[PDB]
Write a protein that binds this ligand. Structure first.
Ligand SMILES: Cc1ccc(N2CCN(CC[C@@H]3NC(=O)c4ccccc43)CC2)cc1C
Ligand SMILES: Cc1ccc(N2CCN(CC[C@@H]3NC(=O)c4ccccc43)CC2)cc1C
Ligand SMILES: [Cl-]
Lengths: 305, 305
């Protein structure tokens, strides 16, 4: 028993992390097969980041300007190209540790593990969610750009995030591995504010099911509700609207526990209207929304990789 | 910026996890050099666990009864012995992925990463603390026994925990890698309750320093206190007493932020007496106590491995 914020094992990704240096800027790259992926702002100085023209800046860069280091051994760059906001550096050696992998663009509300790295070396691993405003709340210092987020299905790593930017408000923005930013953000040091950070309702409900499975049930009540009624309360509290698709996804957890989804919605409604009254749920004093329904099933079942 | 509950990269430990089967019981083992470490209750049936006599049960076991599998390849057991509550299975092949490692017995209040495994396969990684009552609050299902906890210093893995038991209250108990349980617990299915789960004061203070570094400062006040006065409040709220040793350990964080340790203690005192008033600190609505001072410095600095 017990329920913890849990990241995927990071070993398969650790074997893909390299250091990329262009001029006086060093960050992280992802080495898969014979290609290294990294943020294109590696070619920028801190001064360029105010109004960079990446196509023009790149004209002044040759293969030998991108210094790529895997541990203590240097990689030979035999080509480079820009795809959206990432650079693809072709190297003459395929990564011998390349796992089975995919590139995926996730939807807001989906969770993933981040391997925070500096100078190509892993520092730590933690779990994140793509927020509804297309930010993530991570832990990134200077030099962490190029760190990636991922999910694993048995033996296949699905990469979904590369870290690019920190907004003035302390939240983080980045791209998929095709170099397209999540949300409206750009790799320029400018005024770009995040929208409303709404709560991921379906994830809260999944986590309440996890609580019931692991013994925390004080919040269960005698009430039920409807999608439309519940969503009147969700809107008031800046929760995402709950859809029938969400209800269907919660079906398995509802079957395991015997608690109808709309009954759990009534529990959640009372928790929003009355608060926690100083109590806790799975060791939290707020409603956790960075576990997906699949995360809960996975951790409560013991799926391995 | 940003501060997250962060685990060590798990790759070095993933390469050490194997499956151990004795009779009809399967759990995890740790393969380092030519020795596999696992909980001795692998030799028990669910019925033996009520009043097991391990020395007698072991007389009926031979090397060939311990089935050890590393991925898809079987390991040959050439010897076995019991050390306290773990078995050491000598195998004829040294683990080629053995990292630099140490066995450490941690003190209550210290944190570590857990690689949860089932059938020798990693499932996920998360951060834990050795509670003052010598339990840990983990995420363990049947088959997870033998999963280990660890810290990493650059390239050396310090193993400090192996998982053995879940108490009726849903918390977890285990041993160091010499097989000695933390606290008074035993590998028998009996009535053993955990003591008071007091809060790790020095860790709370470290996390408040982390909050200040990352922008959350609403809780800073105009007050100070003394160790003795603060500890009168700590006792009331089931917090560990703060010692001068704790104050000294917080010195570096105090120097970086310019906030005297006793001033932060006064902030913590007001938070205990008045609550959070519906506010949050680093995304938490309660006072987090599973970051050590070293954890905070590490994550706020970007140390790598
Ligand atoms: C001692 C002991 C040991 C094991 C178990 N059982 C092991 C399996 N476990 C599966 C449940 C899982 N949790 C969900 O929410 C879910 C959803 C869809 C499919 C599957 C699941 C339940 C508990 C029980 C006891 C008392
Ligand atoms: C854009 C940018 C980039 C980098 C930085 N600085 C990088 C280094 N960083 C070290 C601090 C660290 N945090 C502690 O609490 C601690 C304790 C003991 C020793 C060291 C530390 C501080 C911030 C600042 C800005 C504005
Ligand atoms: Cl909380």
């Amino acid at each position: 028993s017990g329920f913890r914020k849990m990241a995927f094992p990071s070993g398969k990704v650790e074997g893909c992390m390299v250091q990329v240096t262009c001029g006086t800027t060093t960050l992280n790259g992802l080495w898969l097969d014979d290609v290294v992926y990294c943020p294109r702002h590696v070619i920028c100085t801190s001064e360029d980041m105010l109004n960079p023209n990446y196509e023009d800046l790149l004209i002044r860069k040759s293969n030998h300007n991108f210094l790529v280091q895997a541990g203590n051994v240097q990689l030979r760059v035999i080509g480079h190209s820009m795809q959206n906001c990432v650079l693809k550096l072709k190297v003459d050696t395929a990564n011998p540790k390349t796992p089975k992998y995919k590139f995926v663009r996730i939807q807001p509300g989906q969770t993933f593990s981040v391997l925070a790295c500096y100078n190509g070396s892993p520092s730590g691993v933690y779990q994140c969610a793509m927020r509804p405003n297309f930010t993530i709340k991570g832990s990134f210092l200077n030099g962490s750009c190029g760190s990636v987020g991922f999910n694993i299905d048995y033996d296949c790593v699905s990469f979904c995030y590369m870290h690019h930017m920190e907004l003035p408000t302390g939240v983080h923005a980045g791209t998929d591995l095709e170099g397209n930013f999540y949300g409206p953000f750009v790799d320029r040091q400018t005024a770009q504010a995040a929208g409303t950070d709404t709560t991921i309702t379906v994830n809260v409900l999944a986590w309440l099911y996890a609580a019931v499975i692991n013994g925390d049930r004080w919040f269960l009540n005698r009430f039920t509700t409807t999608l439309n009624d519940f969503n009147l309360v969700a809107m008031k509290y800046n929760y995402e609207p709950l859809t029938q698709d969400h209800v269907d996804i919660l079906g398995p957890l509802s079957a395991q526990t015997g608690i109808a989804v709309l009954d759990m919605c009534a529990s959640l409604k009372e928790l929003l209207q009355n608060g926690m009254n100083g109590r806790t749920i799975l060791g939290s004093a707020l409603l956790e929304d960075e576990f997906t329904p699949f995360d809960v099933v996975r951790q409560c079942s013991g799926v391995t990789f």
